[PDB]
RNA sequence: AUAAUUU
């Protein structure tokens, strides 16, 4: 029973840490704007507008409880517990040629998912393939899922090991896997 | 329609 509460809390921490994480934050206009208002602090009242978090829970107390137990320890909770922020002690990394070169080399391309698959479907399928930091479902201008995605692993090592595996299939359907830069090379 | 949404 309470194990499901732990499961819910782990999901809450992951979703919030994604929003304020190294991959997302630098390209999140709405969030970078909010962060400029009160020294990084963002009211839970605002955090609740984030769709994926909303679907997990809308309750402030549950969110605070979950974050206070987070292992990652990326987020800080205010004293009155009405707002949160990325720790000032965990600044965003400087984006150098080296950093970008490393991110590109940890990025993979995977084609072959059914057009109706959701982000949750894919996340679950990637659960046993290594540490993932970002999943980008490729869509058309009108936001229609093409069935192909880009995945960013925690390191070039886990990325390499994923691409090295030739017998991978989704719901018993073959998949085309390539390093992102290799996918572009062809295109 | 910054009515931005893995906001």
Author numbering: 6 to 192
Reproduce text from the manuscript describing this model.
The eukaryotic La protein recognizes the 3′ poly(U) sequences of nascent RNA polymerase III transcripts to assist folding and maturation. Human La (hLa) is a 408 amino acid monomeric modular protein containing three structured domains: a La motif and two RNA recognition motifs (RRMs 1 and 2); these are followed by a largely unstructured C-terminal tail that possesses a short basic motif (SBM) and a nuclear localization signal (NLS). The LaNTD contains the La motif and RRM1, the domains required for high-affinity binding of 3′ oligo(U) RNA (Kenan, 1995; Goodier et al., 1997; Jacks et al., 2003; Alfano et al., 2004); indeed, it has been shown that the two domains must act synergistically to bind 3′ oligo(U) tails (Goodier et al., 1997; Ohndorf et al., 2001; Alfano et al., 2004; Dong et al., 2004). We have solved the crystal structures of four LaNTD:RNA complexes, each containing a different single-stranded RNA oligomer, and compared them to the structure of a previously published LaNTD:RNA complex containing partially duplex RNA.
